[model samples]
Target chain A: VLRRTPLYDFHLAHGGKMVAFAGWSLPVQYRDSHTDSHLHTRQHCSLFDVSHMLQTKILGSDRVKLMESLVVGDIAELRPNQGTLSLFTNEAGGILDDLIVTNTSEGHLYVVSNAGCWEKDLALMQDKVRELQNQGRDVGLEVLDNALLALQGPTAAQVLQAGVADDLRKLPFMTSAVMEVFGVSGCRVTRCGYTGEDGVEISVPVAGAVHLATAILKNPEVKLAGLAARDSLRLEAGLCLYGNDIDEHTTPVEGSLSWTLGKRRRAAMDFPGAKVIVPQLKGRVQRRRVGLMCEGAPMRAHSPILNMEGTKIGTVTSGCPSPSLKKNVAMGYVPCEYSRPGTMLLVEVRRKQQMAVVSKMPFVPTNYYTL
Target chain B: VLRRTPLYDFHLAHGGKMVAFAGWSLPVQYRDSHTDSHLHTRQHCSLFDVSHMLQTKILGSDRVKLMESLVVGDIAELRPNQGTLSLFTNEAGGILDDLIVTNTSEGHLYVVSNAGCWEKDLALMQDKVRELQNQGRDVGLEVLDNALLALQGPTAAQVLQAGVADDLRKLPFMTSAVMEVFGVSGCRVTRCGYTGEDGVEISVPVAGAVHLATAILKNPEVKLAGLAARDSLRLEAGLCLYGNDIDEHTTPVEGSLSWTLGKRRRAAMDFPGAKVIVPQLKGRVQRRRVGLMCEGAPMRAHSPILNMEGTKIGTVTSGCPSPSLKKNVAMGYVPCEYSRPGTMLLVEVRRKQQMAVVSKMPFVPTNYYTL
Candidate 1:
């Protein structure tokens, strides 16, 4: 069955073709071509209705302690209103999902995760919570089935600031605040986006989300962007798409996301899959996630990577032409020895062995504000 | 002003947010996440309404000779039902627009051009046609202000085949056939697409486009895709975009699309830009386009290309993270010597000279069918 979002009718009014997606009927793009829309999001402000992403709140006096038990981020060190990129691991330390955990002043912890993995994530969270509760722990779990919106780009904060009462400038990158967004009450705005730009993610009640977004769209700099642009923008920004970039078999260290684990979390070493992950932190893994630049064409996931001598070294994980950078770039895992920055390599593009090299992540400069 | 495609209502109904672009109201993405749609298109058969692209027909006994005088493709040798990806080159052999010229069995030439440059293309063709007519030539030009739909993916053929007559298997890749698409009469179906997939592009009259698309969508396997998926898919497929990949300032040889100029065309030496292009085929070209992989982030247009020693060599023209490959990729011009496979280079991304290398292109394998 094709389900429609609250904005479905609004999209049609503005010129959208409703199509089925992820078990729902959605517009791929509203009124523009995907290329134009994708570039628009990169050049201007784009609003994405990401209500599909699952939101949750962990409550308890020992919330930070509880969060650390399953994930591998130093939750205790997260300053008020600040969040850290973290991942849930299994008993073997393989990533279940990459997520954001925010430390708020309301004696609660806010978390957001991928919508596609909502069912599994919720079940995992419930199971973990049950286990903890059975151990005489009193932690509360609240799922914020509220609507979520991601407003991204350099002009995003400014366009949003024009309408909101709270000082958006004070909210630096990766921080969150409950503010009145466009006269809407109780909007939780996070200063982070997957696009690697200075942007914000606002959480609004489902009833008011459409109104708030409609109001925000009135801003001259704001535009509605769809999945096409968002995917390219994030890839250009070097962010991971859950299904394409990371999955069950990928681990934090192998995915080149081990940096998110704070020192305390690493030292304490008490997360799920710690036994397998701890060793990775010290020594080398069989394969390491690395960035590859191919010679002839874009290297896609599953394309074999070869050594300089034409031996298979690894496989490409993701690749695309960056609208901002104007070049083909890719991310993949290679043997540990070939994972260094500037380590020349090759990838088999089609029937030809194209020359390539291992480089640091992102292939382009990300503009996300680090403050 | 925003013109609507036949699928405009579908975009709106599905929560697509609309915006004005290229004088047409288009869909950026529905419900704020272009990335999701981009990914979905990669995994399944995504349908895109490329109605805005300019379509043209040239009819006359001298059409082949006339078109050859304008473009650098072997128009005369193009078998009926076959199309050649070619470019409109100026006197200097610089590309005016990248287009596809299909030889129709009806003894007419069908051409598809970039939407944003249709006005210029029409004007240029009209001027050239007028000049030829004054020279005692007979040719007629008609612009197809119609609807163009691209059904793309590994499974797109199976889904679209259900709605049309004639064995899709007989419709070889890069070939076209005049057929009733979903009961629409007098429509041209081209087995071509911008996405690097086994797909087909259906051209129909504007009035009947909506009906055709609706009927095609009746097959659940065909999902409506927006610009979000289109952009990433094209990037992943390693297809060059019109404005970003080829333009008035770029020549075929310099753009690394020299292969588009067929063997006979090169040998004939009579095309509009042949004098300049033919010489470059043998002589040393000033600059050449090559693939690039990045370090740290996605590369954007105008990012400088550098030599191993950090000397500015050239500039990036197009780039993105490929959805299928999950890596950043880009196309750019560099000095001919450095454009070879695996030539070490650097790209100044975010004011930092990151390590890069000359890579080959298509960036991925072409999934076209063999005869």
Candidate 2:
């Protein structure tokens, strides 16, 4: 059965077209077309019900050590209330999932991962925890029942600050804090979003989810956005989506995610996939992820990338018509030799070769809160 | 990017509305409403592109022995060309997936399993194989890149018998053969289907999938049926869909799949979950799956099933409007005490209680050709 989120009723009342996404009944689009929703999120504040994203807490003295054993991130280096986007890799260096891990002030790790990785992530964490305990390490994992809502866009902080007394400016991008949100106690507010917009994700207890969401949505600029808009927004911002942009077969190096590897961890070479990923840092990967600009037709995933001579070069992992640019944009993996920006290429769309070019990522510049 | 089946072009040419299902792009319904497709499949022969089903061949000296260790089926008892429905269970007697295992005349076990369970099933099988090899057991497992099709309904035999020389009446239910179909050699045809109708599931090489499908559809009685119809058909047949009616948490006894347990295996109690399942055979299980004939509206999955006094009992796992029976038929898990045939129950439909009854399954009588 598809699970309903705490804000499921709210979604329906606001004209959501509920679709099964990652085992949850989530809205794909709301009252407007997907393209419209995408543009709206980029230009103005929008409220999104992201309760489906798995929320978890890792509690223990060895939490950082255990987390470092699984991911490429340097958890010990994270200051309190700070977070980083990290990749969880298998023993083979292939990406298992992409998630956010925050070192909270409470000495616990507040983690949020993709909804699609819910079961796999839990199993991975629990399995490691068991192995660690057998070797005399103590750590605890808790899957939280908190409902998450993302208020995103340029004016997001201004709208969100209305519900809380905390200085919104103090919580910079990729930082978090446990704050009372819209009178909801024990809510964790993280200044981050998938859309590359300056935003805050409020994780509230399930009982207070509707109240918190309504409070944020009270801002006239904060209309509801769904998965359809979220996809385009993230794609335009050069974000890699798990299962699509990366999988168990795509290594961190190939996924252009080597930046996520911790500097000290690399020197120590002590992570799950360090043997494979560490060496790749100095060597050229077989393929490299790149952004693409296409002509003739709207690009869609699986469209083959080709050279001017029509030789197949690669395939698009994610693609769509960029709502902001009013042009076709895509993210794909191409041979290292052909990954330079502005390299001319062709993408096969319905068997017809259309002109394409390797381009820099974030088709639209990200709008994170920074000085 | 969505995976394309071998019949991708054929589906597109036939006006199929391709949708992502289990990582593959498949037709939900083509050229007609889902209801029309459901009705069409029951009245006449229909061709279903079941290429998404994962096919495998297990070879080597200890194939049956290794297979028996994972599932609660007596694989050694199966005669050549005979297939049996089997369950792969966890140590707790919970069904991981339901599959068809055929002891082919070629001295290999031909297996067909659900596409949704492909990765987990392969991992489980590989893990078991690794464990067994440490103790020195010789078994080889191979995933076959074959496209599967189902020709179903009362007219299925007549439509398929024309393409092959075999006598249609002689091939009883659950039996299979490697035969030539429409000049396409090396086709494995099994007398089985999800529709509870007389049908043959043909496994064809990728190169011959289109040719075979075209030949079958050449018959006037045969039209294309997609996943939409297949779902309703399976639901009406009272078959459990993994992740819905059954999962790693649902035991075979509770799923009403105890009949699939081998008689000999019960005596030996040698499978993974045998310790837990064997004892449950004589004990009154906490919950038993029952078929329900519901009034008022169509009962969907997760609809609450209530006792006579309006107390929650269980939830409906699968339900649909039976095209043949012209009524709403559903399957759900209920307390053993309320699972008796004709027992009155109430189902919450759109928040209103509707009268329901514990009824016999196979809402429409099956039409399989039996010896």
Most DockQ-accurate candidate: 2
All models, DockQ values?
0.01, 0.01
Task: For residue A81, give model 2's deviation from the true position in Å.
Answer: 1.2
Interface RMSD of each: 29.0, 21.9
- Worst-scoring 10-residue span by lDDT in model 2 chain A: A127-136
Model 1, span B253-311: residue lDDT tens = 87878888878988878776777788788855898877887556788788999898878
Looking at model 2, give its docking quality level: incorrect
TM-score per prediction, in order, is 0.49, 0.54
Candidate 2 residue B356 C-alpha distance from true site, Å = 37
Q: What DockQ would you assign to candidate 1?
A: 0.01
Model 2 per-residue lDDT tens digits across residues B1-371: 46667688789999999999987789998998888888878888789998878788887788898898888888999999999999998888989899999999998999999988876786566545544543456776766656799999989998998999988787899999999999988999999989888898999866677888999998899889888888999888777789988998888888888888888877777777877777777875789889999766888899999998879999999888877787889999999999998999999888888898899887778888998
Question: Counting only residues 3 or more apart in sequence or on different chains, how many pairs clash (N, Cα, C under 3 Å) in candidate 1?
Answer: 98
- The collision pairs in model 2 are none
